[PDB]
From Swiss-Prot:
The lineage of its organism: Eukaryota, Metazoa, Chordata, Craniata, Vertebrata. It is found in: Cytoplasm, Cytosol. SUPFAM superfamilies: Indolic compounds 2,3-dioxygenase-like. Expressed in mature dendritic cells located in lymphoid organs (including lymph nodes, spleen, tonsils, Peyers's patches, the gut lamina propria, and the thymic medulla), in some epithelial cells of the female genital tract, as well as in endothelial cells of term placenta and in lung parenchyma. Weakly or not expressed in most normal tissues, but mostly inducible in most tissues. Expressed in more than 50% of tumors, either by tumoral, stromal, or endothelial cells (expression in tumor is associated with a worse clinical outcome). Not overexpressed in tumor-draining lymph nodes. This is Indoleamine 2,3-dioxygenase 1. Keywords: Cytoplasm, Dioxygenase, Heme, Immunity, Iron, Metal-binding, Oxidoreductase, Tryptophan catabolism. Gene3D superfamilies: 1.20.58.480. It comes from the Eukaryota.
Length: 371
């Protein structure tokens, strides 16, 4: 019911690679975005389409692949070549089906993390394991944007977190059964798997270039909420009356970090600050099943209060290890932002952005029991 895989966690277990033949006009545009943008034929070829209906998309993986295809097409149409020439209105041939599809999956009509990472992958050899060399994305925007490296490294962090996520039922089951040793073991295991996820994060340096990321890829993943280039928003023609605002694709849209914040009693979304508000808004951009999972974790008894009541140095230490793993992940993530956003931007927007991430990191570090 929560749609969480044992192996790949929040990611889609094995994404559908082909659409039905009825939507071959969509798939051809999405498969050839690098050429169609560079040549300048994308906007024209989207302009002259047919309003294809949603009813032939039968199952969930088909509907998700359609969201990814239509999402990638919508980014490249709006942002064009990505040198400031923008379209303020999305044609009703593409906008109506995309909006009707998006209402069915309870997601906004914009490319989200669930599309371009969680559903945008495949294994080359099905009989080999989930490593970077054996994997590839389904869609990219331009040549030399490093879509593969960025989406797959994000995906591999989701996969690393799946080892911790599958232990969560043991944590709550151990608390109700009043089983101290099982709980201690489950927390050390979660801490161990979140420590492993940090090493997976290191691969970002191997497969993504700062200048390629900042110049090319960042422009296509940006949205139309609080954006000067579309201050009113994007007009979805033939569906909504006025231009609607929707935030761009981010890995703040991931459920991984929020999952373990809620599990460990770290009250990020508590208070009325910008950090709390941002993280609560990012839930709207997650699949409904994953929102329901985060709701379910909030509804359960507090792991934090359970551990604090027992006067047990082993349980406190194990709970701290989980918290420390999250702090370390966010601490490393700040370094990435310095390398991949701050330095390229230089060669108070940068200051506020780092203070956001540091507020979230500080809220995490405040939850430690020893310090
Ligand atoms: C080049 C790589 C990366 C850059 C430049 C980057 C940049 C950022 C920025 C600027 C934010 C602030 C929110 C926003 O304005 O959208 C953010 C938030 C976030 N990023 Fe990344 N990021 C990168 C890679 C990753 C990866 C691989 C993950 C893996 C899951 C990740 C997870 C997050 C999360 C969870 C947040 C939400 C804030 C939090 O919970 O601490 N990011 N990122
Ligand atoms: N204008 S801004 O400050 O750069 N805001 C956007 C920042 N976030 C990002 N920009 O570019 N990738 C980002 C990001 N950060 O965690 N994660 C991310 C990871 C995988 C994806 F498929 C997508 Br889509 C986003």
């Amino acid at each position: 019911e929560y749609h969480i895989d044992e192996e790949v966690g929040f990611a889609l277990p094995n994404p559908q690679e082909n659409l039905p033949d009825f939507y071959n006009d969509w798939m051809f545009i999405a498969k050839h975005l690098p050429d169609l943008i560079e040549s300048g034929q994308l906007r024209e070829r989207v302009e002259k389409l047919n309003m294809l209906s949603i009813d032939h998309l039968t199952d969930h993986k088909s509907q998700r692949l359609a969201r990814l295809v239509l999402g990638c097409i919508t980014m490249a149409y709006v942002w064009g070549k990505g040198h400031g020439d923008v379209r303020k209105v999305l044609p009703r041939n593409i906008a109506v089906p995309y909006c009707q599809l998006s209402k069915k999956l309870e997601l906004p009509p914009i490319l989200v993390y669930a599309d371009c990472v969680l559903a945008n992958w495949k294994k080359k050899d099905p009989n080999k394991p989930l490593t970077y060399e054996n994997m590839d994305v389904l869609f990219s925007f331009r040549d030399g944007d490093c879509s593969k490296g960025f989406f797959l490294v994000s995906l591999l962090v989701e996969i690393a977190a799946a080892s911790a996520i599958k232990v969560i039922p043991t944590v709550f089951k151990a608390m109700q059964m009043q089983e101290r040793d099982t709980l201690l073991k489950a927390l050390l295991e979660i801490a161990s798997c979140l420590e492993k996820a940090l090493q997976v994060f290191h691969q970002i340096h191997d497969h993504v270039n700062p200048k390629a990321f900042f110049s090319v890829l960042r422009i296509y993943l940006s949205g139309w909420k609080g954006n000067p280039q579309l201050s009113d928003g994007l007009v979805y023609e033939g569906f909504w009356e006025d231009p609607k605002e929707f935030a761009g694709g981010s890995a703040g849209q991931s459920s991984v970090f929020q999952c373990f914040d809620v599990l460990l009693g770290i009250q990020q979304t508590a208070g009325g600050g910008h950090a709390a508000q941002f993280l609560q808004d990012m839930r709207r951009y997650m699949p409904p099943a994953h929102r329901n999972f985060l709701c379910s974790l909030e509804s359960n008894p507090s792991v934090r209060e359970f551990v604090l009541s027992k006067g047990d140095a082993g349980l406190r230490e194990a709970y701290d290890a989980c918290v420390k793993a999250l702090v370390s992940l966010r601490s490393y993530h700040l370094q990435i932002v310095t390398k991949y956003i701050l330095i390229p931007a230089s060669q108070t927007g940068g200051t506020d952005l780092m203070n956001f991430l540091k507020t979230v990191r500080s809220t995490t570090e405040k939850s430690l029991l020893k310090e």
